[PDB]
C-alpha cells in the first residue's frame, strides 16, 4: 500500500529576527519514495534548496530533510509545500517559530 508523509517545518537554531539561520522541512513516514518538496518565502519558491540522501526507518518508511539558509524577519512568512502520490493536492505547512 502507500503511506502519506508527515511534515515538520522548523529552524536549526532558535529564531531571531536578523540572525542568519537554517529553514528545515522534514518529511517522514511516507511510501513510495517519490515526493516533491518546496520551501516557500512569502508564497514563492526558494531557489537552490538542498536535501538529504534518501533514507528510511525501521518500518521501511522514508524520510528526507530539505533545507536552506535564511534570515527570519518579523514580516517574512515561510512554509513548506509537499506533494506525494497519496495527496490529491499539495499540502502547505506554515512555519511557526514555536513549533
Amino acid at each position: 500500500i502507500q503511506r502519506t508523509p508527515k511534515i515538520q517545518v522548523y529552524s536549526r537554531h532558535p529564531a531571531e529576527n536578523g540572525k542568519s539561520n537554517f529553514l528545515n522541512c522534514y518529511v517522514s513516514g511516507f511510501h513510495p519514495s517519490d515526493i516533491e518538496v518546496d520551501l516557500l518565502k512569502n508564497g514563492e519558491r526558494i531557489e537552490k534548496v538542498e536535501h538529504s540522501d534518501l533514507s528510511f526507518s525501521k518500518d521501511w518508511s522514508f524520510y528526507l530533510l530539505y533545507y536552506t539558509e535564511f534570515t527570519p524577519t518579523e514580516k517574512d512568512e515561510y512554509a513548506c509545500r509537499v506533494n506525494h502520490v497519496t495527496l490529491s493536492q499539495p499540502k502547505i505547512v506554515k512555519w511557526d517559530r514555536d513549533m
Binding site: 522548523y10 517522514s28 513510495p32 521501511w60 518508511s61 514555536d98
Partner: protein
C-alpha cells in the same frame, strides 16, 4: 557504550524513465558516513563524515564496485519480484534492504541483520541466529529456498562476525571525537495561553545526539500519554536532533505538570516545570 553500523539500499523501478534507481546510505549510529546514487553524474561511493575521508583510494574503489555490482543485483531482484507476484512491467516498485551489525562497549558482536522489503512490506529477513530465514509470504519462500541452497546465511554470518564489526571498530576509533560523544539535550518549557482557561505547555529538547530520547509529561506524577502531543524526533541539520512534547492544561494548574527527559548524554533523568 553500544554502537551500530547499517547500510540501507533503496531500489526503485520507473518504467519509461530508465533503469531502476539504486541508492545506498551508510550509518554508524545516527551519523551518515557514506552514500551512493546510481543517478549521480559519475556514480561512486562518497564520504559524508570527516573520519571516513582518511580511508585510502583502494577503499573507495572497492566500495564503489560493490555498489555498482549490487545495483545490478537489485535491478534483477525487481524483475524477479514482478514474476513472483504476477505483476505487470508497467508499474513502479521498490525493494529496500537493511543490513549491518550492533556491537557492545567491548566491541563484540551483539547481533547482525540482513533484511529486505518489497513495496514497503516485509519480504525476507535473516534471523537473529544468523543461520535461518523468515519469509513473509510464498513469494519470499522461493527466495528463502534459493538462499538456503546457496548457504547465504553462513556467508552473511561470516561478514557480520568479521568485516562488519572490524570496520565498525575502526570507524569508532577514527571518529571517537564525535561518534563517542553524546551531546545532552538543551531543555526548556514554554507557556502559550490558548484561551481564558486553557494553556499549552511545550517541553523542548534541542541539540542532542544521538537521536534516542524520551520526553514525557506527568500530571500530579501520572503519565499523560493520551493527552500529550509528541512530535517525531527531527534532524537539526548540524548532526543534532530536536523534539518536543506538549499538553493543554487548565489555567492555574501549570505547577501540577512536570516534564521528564531521558537521554544518554544526561547523567540522570531531568525533571522540568513551567518557570514564570
Amino acid at each position: 557504550g553500544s554502537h551500530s553500523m547499517r547500510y540501507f539500499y533503496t531500489a526503485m523501478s520507473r518504467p519509461g524513465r530508465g533503469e531502476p534507481r539504486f541508492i545506498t546510505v551508510g550509518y554508524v549510529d545516527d551519523t551518515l558516513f557514506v552514500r551512493f546514487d546510481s543517478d549521480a553524474t559519475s556514480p561512486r561511493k562518497e564520504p559524508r563524515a570527516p573520519w571516513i575521508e582518511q580511508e585510502g583510494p583502494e577503499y573507495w574503489d572497492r566500495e564503489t564496485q560493490i555498489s555498482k555490482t549490487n545495483t545490478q543485483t537489485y535491478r534483477e531482484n525487481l524483475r524477479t519480484a514482478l514474476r513472483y507476484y504476477n505483476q505487470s512491467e508497467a508499474g513502479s516498485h521498490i525493494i529496500q534492504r537493511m543490513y549491518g551489525c550492533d556491537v557492545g562497549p567491548d566491541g563484540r558482536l551483539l547481533r547482525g541483520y540482513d533484511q529486505d522489503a518489497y513495496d514497503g512490506k516485509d519480504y525476507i529477513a535473516l534471523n537473529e541466529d544468523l543461520s535461518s530465514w523468515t519469509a513473509a509470504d510464498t513469494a519470499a519462500q522461493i527466495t528463502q529456498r534459493k538462499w538456503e541452497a546457496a548457504r547465504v546465511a553462513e556467508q552473511d554470518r561470516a561478514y557480520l562476525e568479521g568485516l562488519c564489526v572490524e570496520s565498525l571498530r575502526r570507524y569508532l576509533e577514527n571518529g571517537k571525537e564525535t561518534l563517542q560523544r553524546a551531546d545532552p539535550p538543551k531543555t526548556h518549557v514554554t507557556h502559550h495561553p490558548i484561551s481564558d482557561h486553557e494553556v499549552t505547555l511545550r517541553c523542548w529538547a534541542l541539540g542532542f545526539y544521538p537521536a534516542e530520547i524520551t520526553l514525557t509529561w506527568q500530571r500530579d506524577g501520572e503519565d499523560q500519554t493520551q493527552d500529550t502531543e509528541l512530535v517525531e524526533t527531527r534532524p537539526a541539520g548540524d548532526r543534532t536532533f530536536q523534539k518536543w512534547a506538549a499538553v493543554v492544561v487548565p489555567s492555574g494548574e501549570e505547577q501540577r505538570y512536570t516534564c521528564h527527559v531521558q537521554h544518554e548524554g544526561l547523567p540522570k533523568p531531568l525533571t522540568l516545570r513551567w518557570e514564570p
